Amino acid sequence: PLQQTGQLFGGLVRDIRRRYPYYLSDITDAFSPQVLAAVIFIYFAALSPAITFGGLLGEKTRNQMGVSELLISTAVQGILFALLGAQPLLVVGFSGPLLVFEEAFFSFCETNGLEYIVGRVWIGFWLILLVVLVVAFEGSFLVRFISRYTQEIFSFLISLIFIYETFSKLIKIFQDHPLQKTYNYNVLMVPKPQGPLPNTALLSLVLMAGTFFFAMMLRKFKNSSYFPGKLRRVIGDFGVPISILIMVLVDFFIQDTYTQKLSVPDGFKVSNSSARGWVIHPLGLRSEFPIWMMFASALPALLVFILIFLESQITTLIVSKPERKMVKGSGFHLDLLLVVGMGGVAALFGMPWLSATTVRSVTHANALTVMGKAQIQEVKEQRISGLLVAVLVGLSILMEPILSRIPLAVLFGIFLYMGVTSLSGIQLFDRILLLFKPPKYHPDVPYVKRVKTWRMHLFTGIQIICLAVLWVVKSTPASLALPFVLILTVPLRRVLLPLIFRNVELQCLDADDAKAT
Amino acid sequence: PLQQTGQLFGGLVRDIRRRYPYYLSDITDAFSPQVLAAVIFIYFAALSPAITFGGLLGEKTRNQMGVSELLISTAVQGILFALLGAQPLLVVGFSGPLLVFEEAFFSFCETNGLEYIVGRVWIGFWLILLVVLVVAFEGSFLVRFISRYTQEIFSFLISLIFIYETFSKLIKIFQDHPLQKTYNYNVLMVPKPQGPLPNTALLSLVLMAGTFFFAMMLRKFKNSSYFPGKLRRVIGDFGVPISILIMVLVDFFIQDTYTQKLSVPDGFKVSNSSARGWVIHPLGLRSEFPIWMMFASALPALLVFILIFLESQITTLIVSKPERKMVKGSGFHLDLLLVVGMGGVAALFGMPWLSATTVRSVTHANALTVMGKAQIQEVKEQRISGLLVAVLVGLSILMEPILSRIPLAVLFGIFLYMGVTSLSGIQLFDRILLLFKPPKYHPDVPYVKRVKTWRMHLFTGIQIICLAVLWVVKSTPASLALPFVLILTVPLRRVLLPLIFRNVELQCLDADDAKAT
Amino acid sequence: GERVQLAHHFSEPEITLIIFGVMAGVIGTILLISYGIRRL
Amino acid sequence: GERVQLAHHFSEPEITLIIFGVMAGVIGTILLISYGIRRL
Numbered sequence A, B: 001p002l003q004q005t006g007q008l009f010g011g012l013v014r015d016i017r018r019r020y021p022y023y024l025s026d027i028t029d030a031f032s033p034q035v036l037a038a039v040i041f042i043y044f045a046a047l048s049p050a051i052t053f054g055g056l057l058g059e060k061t062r063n064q065m066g067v068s069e070l071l072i073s074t075a076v077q078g079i080l081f082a083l084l085g086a087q088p089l090l091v092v093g094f095s096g097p098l099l100v101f102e103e104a105f106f107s108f109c110e111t112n113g114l115e116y117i118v119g120r121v122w123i124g125f126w127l128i129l130l131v132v133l134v135v136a137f138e139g140s141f142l143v144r145f146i147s148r149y150t151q152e153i154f155s156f157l158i159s160l161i162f163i164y165e166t167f168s169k170l171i172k173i174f175q176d177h178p179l180q181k182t183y184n185y186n187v188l189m190v191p192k193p194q195g196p197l198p199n200t201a202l203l204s205l206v207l208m209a210g211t212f213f214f215a216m217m218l219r220k221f222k223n224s225s226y227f228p229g230k231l232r233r234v235i236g237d238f239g240v241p242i243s244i245l246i247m248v249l250v251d252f253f254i255q256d257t258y259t260q261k262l263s264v265p266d267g268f269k270v271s272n273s274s275a276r277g278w279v280i281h282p283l284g285l286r287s288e289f290p291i292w293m294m295f296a297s298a299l300p301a302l303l304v305f306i307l308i309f310l311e312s313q314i315t316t317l318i319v320s321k322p323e324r325k326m327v328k329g330s331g332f333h334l335d336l337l338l339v340v341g342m343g344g345v346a347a348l349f350g351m352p353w354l355s356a357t358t359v360r361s362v363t364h365a366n367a368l369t370v371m372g373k374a375q376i377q378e379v380k381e382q383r384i385s386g387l388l389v390a391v392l393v394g395l396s397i398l399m400e401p402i403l404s405r406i407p408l409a410v411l412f413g414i415f416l417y418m419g420v421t422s423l424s425g426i427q428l429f430d431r432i433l434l435l436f437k438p439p440k441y442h443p444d445v446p447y448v449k450r451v452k453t454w455r456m457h458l459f460t461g462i463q464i465i466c467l468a469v470l471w472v473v474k475s476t477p478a479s480l481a482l483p484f485v486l487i488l489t490v491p492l493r494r495v496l497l498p499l500i501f502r503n504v505e506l507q508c509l510d511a512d513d514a515k516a517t
Numbered sequence C, D: 001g002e003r004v005q006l007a008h009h010f011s012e013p014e015i016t017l018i019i020f021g022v023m024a025g026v027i028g029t030i031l032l033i034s035y036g037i038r039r040l
């Protein structure tokens, strides 16, 4: 897949010839209740970040791009990616770095009197130019140099960010409604409670912990030895929907206490009807758009392309490791082209560009993975699950009575479950656990039995340094430099590590498919 | 141990020659941090039942016996039983059936206008006559007729009762402080809050759940492969004190929310100094005690003896099973003599008579158990832990400033931990889990590989009906007939089970030391 | 004891020693009877 | 659109068609150059 042919669009055609022969199985293989449970899981796992990022974007951009634009863009891009992409298991959605770039670009446009939405239109115009030239010259062949080192650093860091944000949301809930001796019994509720309320933070913590506990217990019950095997596996596959339903009913039967619920817009309309329409004029909405910003948009477009490229390509690498039993192939050239082109086209309509998010795609792949008698057996590689997820995300506006009764705390527990379960296949997470284990308890794996224990701990500590450096950069105003610092791990692995490690040590520690050299 | 020697006081003599030679090891074997952790555990595990039952007894008898009398009696009898008893691991304390008898006798005395505390004095006087005759004729040899059947039924039922009451206390906390939109912010707090308060019920639930979670996680960490082994075992042994400390600190740092605390009396004084003193006249306090009630007190003395004998002897059977690796021996004749004689003596001082309770003694035995590399290796058999527990219960009145900062919810979590960890060695509970497993996952044990699966499930279902009948009897005004209904299980095993089960099946299902017939 | 209590002929140690003496006599008599049985 | 928009000579489909045509011309020029290179 990563071979450089030398033919124009050669990788794109081979990606088209690799996956599209399997198109018939991509519909038939989804005829199992495990796929339906995965659909229910990924619907919330994609809808809640969409709503949160849409609200944040609307607040930070004066509703030029809000919840409705993000929902519609997510639905349309997910549908078109599932129906056409070479790796349907990816989930296309908005991410944190994209939000940071949106804030930076809105600040820059507010400084220089530029129209934000038109600048985004021109950035999306320059996005399509870059990805086409990249696919033409097979620029997606450089992803063969992202070894398990960078993949696991990126995945572990993103999982830690997800867990940290999940806990910080509960911290914010406890800050909004602190535990007091006395409260005001008549506090305005519209739009949100203007003052602290009793029993709110504690019930939110209870619901979040209960959802996480039920999800983990049902995940254990899946591998357990209780009940008939078919019924047990059916119930275990539906662990997240069962936990969500249980905690939603629990909160529903407590009428008096206020808990924050899911909020969806009234209709499929623009978030600011006085700012923009559905189509944004490239020459300007109110004022004549400057000619120089049409050419000056290339550099922000370059940064956006770098962000989306790194995110989507590393996500494709992670979800398509050979050890996950992916026997249907993944197309690096086709998926990048579809994602960046859809982002550029959606820019023309004032809608966000999206990327293959790591946590959502990993959770989708995990929910579609069948376990043998501890051992990965097969993966439900099909297009129906992502298509139904995107359709439901689009229909979220229509199903407000169902969503209005779902507390955010339940979804916080689901987020924590996703974050802790995304650490399964990471060898960096395994080698971090070996820091707190005596050497006699280490499992029999190639990086243990052919590398000295202190050498392995030094190798893990070097990655921990990289994780700390990346985490500090995230919490700084220069958090858009994360892709370049992440790329800087590749010279570290392929240049500096051979200066202090032997070939057999690096082969055991940094292996393409967990092989003993 | 349970053989009949045929000599007067023969059983008592053999018990002293069996255990008292180990008296030097009974002090030296306690020089280990696991013993100190067991002391800290069983201190709360015995103090909280003391305070709760003393408060209830004072409520139900107008403080003729209350918290202080129960605390003093528990401390003194525990000290004496630890220094002189043949099974030091038992925890001597008040129990539910004794409280039921106290209420019934108080109602009887109030109906007849008799002095309740003097009637207790005369019952205790008749108690010493019975126990002296029973030990003289070796009446404790009938213990050998109570097999694993009755022992496991009684233990499983008592653990279920403990878990049920631990949850019903939290339910009562929720009932007295319901979740409401409006609370009266000025509610009198002395002596207890007279109206609902915010955040109390949910914080109590959070504290109980967190205590249980930390206890279970530290128990898992004990058997894990993390940390240096000595440090790992030191942390795991102190798991319950660490959980108590963590949750107590968590509640301590939450100043505004009210949680109910441990409340000991102000000092060593009788609960109602307007009614009786420390010494009760056998002839009467206010009126001349009737002559006929002195002779008629034998029947309540018989009932009390039946209750104490059954509970204490079955507890001694449970804690000294051969699969628990007790290599020091236990005396049934000496322990019954000490317990019932001390109870009769304590009746004179207006103090409760106690019994060897199942849950506390099993928890004390488990806290002193050393697990090998799954397999029980040895038990820290010593008299120091029980002596220190009794001393601390006696000093509980003086250490009010430390005890008053510990919430009841933390203790509820600890009691849930005790209940779930007291079901381990019961083979009835192990067979109940086999009702929900496929036969291919049943373990390779004699009662599975020699009895048909449907036969084994029938045998488990017969014991379940006994549990349901015993649970029904507990919830009726005739709850003091429970020992007789439990005694009726002995003919069921020895008469009716041979009518439906083969000899090999009966031997494997009801085995004294878990052997293959 | 506590408060005002009726005065009996025997104090608490006296009556409790009488009760213990009667109890010991009964126990000894029962042991003597049991020893007399099982032999003749 | 929404509110009042500044009037342009080219409508939105016309201007986006012109932009796509210029982009296609640039990409075609680059591809033709790349075809020219690596052969001479």
Ligand SMILES: CCCCCCCC(=O)OC[C@H](COP(=O)(O)O[C@@H]1[C@H](O)[C@H](O)[C@@H](OP(=O)(O)O)[C@H](OP(=O)(O)O)[C@H]1O)OC(=O)CCCCCCC
Residues within 6 Å of the ligand: A227, A228, A229, A230, A231, B435, B436, B437, B438, B439, B440
């Ligand atoms: C509610 C469901 C029905 C309740 C009615 C209860 C009546 C009822 O359902 O029993 C029939 C069936 C017994 O048949 P049986 O034990 O042979 O069924 C085996 C069971 O399904 C295993 O889980 C399978 O192994 P795995 O998991 O794939 O590895 C195994 O397949 P295989 O590998 O050998 O080829 C099967 O053979 O059930 C039970 O399994 C016992 C547990 C029943 C406990 C039910 C307690 C509610």
Ligand SMILES: CCCCCCCC(=O)OC[C@H](COP(=O)(O)O[C@@H]1[C@H](O)[C@H](O)[C@@H](OP(=O)(O)O)[C@H](OP(=O)(O)O)[C@H]1O)OC(=O)CCCCCCC
Residues within 6 Å of the ligand: A435, A436, A437, A438, A439, A440, B227, B228, B229, B230, B231
């Ligand atoms: C705070 C601790 C000190 C931190 C400084 C960290 C530096 C540090 O102190 O480690 C040195 C020491 C090495 O000594 P070592 O590996 O020989 O210690 C073995 C270890 O304790 C096993 O658990 C024991 O088996 P078990 O449990 O009885 O069955 C085994 O006993 P045995 O059967 O062979 O006779 C012991 O030999 O500890 C470690 O194990 C390394 C992992 C430490 C993890 C790093 C700390 C989490």
Ligand SMILES: *[C@@H]1O[C@H](CO)[C@@H](O[C@@H]2O[C@H](CO)[C@@H](O)[C@H](O)[C@H]2NC(C)=O)[C@H](O)[C@H]1NC(C)=O
Residues within 6 Å of the ligand: A062, A063, A064, A271, A272, A274, A275
């Ligand atoms: C929609 O956009 C308009 C203008 O882009 C916003 O109106 C502005 O509101 C800010 C905040 O007070 C101020 O600059 C002015 O009051 C308004 N400016 C102009 C030029 O009208 C409006 O608030 C936005 N609506 C929403 C819901 O975000």
Ligand SMILES: *[C@@H]1O[C@H](CO)[C@@H](O[C@@H]2O[C@H](CO)[C@@H](O)[C@H](O)[C@H]2NC(C)=O)[C@H](O)[C@H]1NC(C)=O
Residues within 6 Å of the ligand: B062, B063, B272, B274, B275
């Ligand atoms: C201590 O005991 C006395 C009696 O000895 C209790 O006083 C009785 O209280 C009940 C309930 O009000 C009524 O029967 C009478 O008011 C009292 N009876 C007599 C004979 O005086 C007193 O309540 C007890 N103290 C506590 C705290 O329960």
Ligand SMILES: CC(C)CCC[C@@H](C)[C@H]1CC[C@H]2[C@@H]3CC=C4C[C@@H](O)CC[C@]4(C)[C@H]3CC[C@]12C
Residues within 6 Å of the ligand: B125, B126, B129, B291, B294, B295, C018, C019, C022, C023
């Ligand atoms: C098992 C023990 C308590 C012995 C059984 C009780 C019987 C046999 C004994 C023990 C204590 C005895 C009482 C002790 C003191 C007196 C006061 C006296 O003016 C009349 C007789 C009377 C009331 C005695 C009657 C008999 C008595 C009740």
Ligand SMILES: CC(C)CCC[C@@H](C)[C@H]1CC[C@H]2[C@@H]3CC=C4C[C@@H](O)CC[C@]4(C)[C@H]3CC[C@]12C
Residues within 6 Å of the ligand: A125, A126, A129, A291, A294, A295, D018, D019, D022, D023
């Ligand atoms: C990669 C894609 C976006 C092409 C790069 C953009 C540059 C080369 C092109 C694309 C569209 C072009 C514009 C098309 C039409 C007009 C209107 C005319 O009255 C002035 C020039 C102006 C404003 C052009 C300037 C140059 C321009 C902005």
